Amino acid sequence: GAMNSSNYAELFNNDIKLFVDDTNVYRVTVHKTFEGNVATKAINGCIFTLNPKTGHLFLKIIHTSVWAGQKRLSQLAKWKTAEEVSALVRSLPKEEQPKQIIVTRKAMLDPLEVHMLDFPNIAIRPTELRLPFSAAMSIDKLSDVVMKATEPQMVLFNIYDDWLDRISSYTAFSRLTLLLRALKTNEESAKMILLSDPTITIKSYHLWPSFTDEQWITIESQMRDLILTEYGRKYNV
Amino acid sequence: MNTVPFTSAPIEVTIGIDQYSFNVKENQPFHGIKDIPIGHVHVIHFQHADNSSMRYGYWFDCRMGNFYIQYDPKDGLYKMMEERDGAKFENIVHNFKERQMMVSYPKIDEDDTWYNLTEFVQMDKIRKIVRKDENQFSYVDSSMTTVQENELSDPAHSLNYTVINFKSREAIRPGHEMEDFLDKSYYLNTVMLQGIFKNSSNYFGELQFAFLNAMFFGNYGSSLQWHAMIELICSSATVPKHMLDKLDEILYYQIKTLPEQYSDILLNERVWNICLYSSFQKNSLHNTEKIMENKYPELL
Ligand SMILES: O=C(O)/C=C/c1ccc(N2CCCC2=O)cc1
């Protein structure tokens, strides 16, 4: 059924599962026309499909040409997401196919269920977690590949870099969600925190800086402070 | 005009005949129902005074044989039977009629209600939904499940309605997922009408039968089928115009006949609000929308 904080450790068991977030698939800027009406201009988007146990991220880049001449784009985007997730599953070897797909938004349930009718044993589930995956486009290397794309493209990443050498997947996921929540709440300050120190760099093959264990503790505390600071700014606390 | 005689009425019971109902007290001179209009299917149904559990009844057509009712004290119900001795049957009926021991089917001349509820319903199709091949009539009761209800448990005693499932491979062409889910026309016209039912008359017949079993027996699986068959049409952008006009008439007479006090349990708010106000056919059912809004504005 639905996925919440009671059964949270289920995310890190040995049943292959994927999160799917569609919040960055259909992206637009809104602007005035010469006649003073309003128009949208699409920009490239992405499907965010993540294995929370291994950190493997299947980033399908959605090029603006897929919207050309189409109507009801916000509805189309959910079905296109479902189509692409189905195509990804079919492309994987049987023993790599997920047993569960968790959608971050309930409006993805019916589109994904209909596209996956051929896989009656893959469970399609919502979640009661509020996951900050929309902020993935605040990760510089991910935003860069999406915006440079001139055609549809799938790019594979490990969103945990090399962290699983030192920490469990439960802890890696908690670190990721804290980082993305901070980037969602105050992107400038979060990137300031992550990059302030020039002697800690991002390896060419990584998305995040090469923090020691002790520095990750400091970074995590600074991110919690940012979130708390912003909470107080928002509600005047 | 035809007749369903009763051997006797040993237990007090409310007897239904089509949309009419009357009470018989435990021993009275009750020997059946006369003046039944030839040309329609009919249903004779029962609710016992001392145990309203199990409404049950029998669909029949007087053109297919001579039928009568006899109480069975072992199985504790009124049973329909066929009399093959035609001369015996005619003499029994004549005597009861000469004795004024039968109630008259109480049809008003002006009243087309029963035709309007059974226009497309045929005995032959009833007997394929309700499988008991040694009888020319068909038993239905309040608790019988449908084939679809069983898939989700005695198959011989089931209602074999046509399974309708909007999230099934039958309903959704590979490659046309969004199209077929948001617009059920493929499922309606190719799968169901061309494929399974062959024509809209058989579709409407099963739709009407489902409604009548829901109304007369409180059969929940029948109510589900009735609403499914409505929603399938209303959720299709492409429906033959004659089907839409006929559906509007069908539904109008069903809503007109529904007892006002059973509306809470026989009408699905979601289906009706979607069909009348959101669906492709939201503006195609003018008669049905008018009676629904005047009779059941609460549901809407
Ligand atoms: O509920 C009611 O209002 C009427 C019930 C009723 C009326 C008439 C009869 N008759 C007619 C023939 C012999 C006989 O018993 C039986 C019940």
UniProtKB/Swiss-Prot annotation, chain A:
Q: What is the effect of changing D21A?
A: Alters protein folding. Severely impaired growth. Strongly reduced growth at 35 degrees Celsius
Q: Where in the cell is it found?
A: Nucleus
Q: Where is the signal peptide?
A: none
Specify where the region named RNase H homology domain lies, as residue ranges.
7-237
What sections of the protein cross the membrane? none
Q: What happens upon changing T104A?
A: Reduced growth at 30 degrees Celsius. Strongly reduced growth at 16 degrees Celsius
**Impact reported for D21N:** Reduced growth at 30 degrees Celsius. Strongly reduced growth at 16 degrees Celsius
Domain of life, per lineage: Eukaryota
**Summary of subunit composition and partner proteins:** Component of the U4/U6-U5 tri-snRNP complex composed of the U4, U6 and U5 snRNAs and at least PRP3, PRP4, PRP6, PRP8, PRP18, PRP31, PRP38, SNU13, SNU23, SNU66, SNU114, SPP381, SMB1, SMD1, SMD2, SMD3, SMX2, SMX3, LSM2, LSM3, LSM4, LSM5, LSM6, LSM7, LSM8, BRR2 and DIB1.
Q: What else is known?
A: Present with 468 molecules/cell in log phase SD medium.
> What's the entry's take on its domains?
The MPN (JAB/Mov34) domain has structural similarity with deubiquitinating enzymes, but lacks the residues that would bind the catalytic metal ion.
**Role noted for this protein:** Functions as a scaffold that mediates the ordered assembly of spliceosomal proteins and snRNAs. Required for association of BRR2 with the spliceosomal U5 snRNP, and the subsequent assembly of the U4/U6-U5 tri-snRNP complex. Functions as a scaffold that positions spliceosomal U2, U5 and U6 snRNAs at splice sites on pre-mRNA substrates, so that splicing can occur. Interacts with both the 5' and the 3' splice site, as well as the branch region. Has a role in branch site-3' splice site selection. Associates with the branch site-3' splice 3'-exon region. Also has a role in cell cycle.
Query: How is this protein named in the record?
Result: Pre-mRNA-splicing factor 8
Organism phylogeny: Eukaryota, Fungi, Dikarya, Ascomycota, Saccharomycotina
In terms of the parent sequence, the fragment covers: 1836 to 2069 of 2413
Swiss-Prot record, chain B:
- Keyword presence, Nucleus: yes
Residues recorded as bearing Phosphothreonine in the entry: T257
List the InterPro entries: AAR2, AAR2_C, AAR2_C_sf, Aar2_N, AAR2_N_sf
Its subcellular locations are: Cytoplasm; Nucleus
| Recorded superkingdom | Eukaryota
Q: Which residues carry this modification: Phosphoserine?
A: S236
Task: Share the record's PTM remark.
Answer: Phosphorylated on serine and tyrosine residues.
Provide a GO biological process annotation.
Answer: spliceosomal snRNP assembly
Keyword terms of this UniProt record? Cytoplasm, mRNA processing, mRNA splicing, Nucleus, Phosphoprotein
One Gene Ontology cellular component term attached to this UniProt record is: U5 snRNP
Q: Does the keyword Nucleus apply?
A: yes
Query: For the region Leucine-zipper, what residue ranges are annotated?
Result: 244-265
How is this protein organized at the quaternary level?
Answer: Heterodimer. Interacts with PRP8 (via RNase H homology domain and MPN domain), competing with BRR2 for the same binding site. Component of a U5 snRNP complex that contains at least the U5 snRNA, PRP8, SNU114, AAR2, SMB1, SMD1, SMD2, SMD3, SME1, SMX2 and SMX3, but is not a component of the U4/U6-U5 tri-snRNP complex.
What family does the database annotate?
Answer: Belongs to the AAR2 family.
Q: What else is known?
A: Present with 7330 molecules/cell in log phase SD medium.
The function of this protein is:
Component of the U5 snRNP complex that is required for spliceosome assembly and for pre-mRNA splicing. Involved in splicing pre-mRNA of the A1 cistron and other genes that are important for cell growth.
Q: What is this protein called?
A: A1 cistron-splicing factor AAR2
Q: Which organism is it from?
A: Saccharomyces cerevisiae (strain ATCC 204508 / S288c) (Baker's yeast)
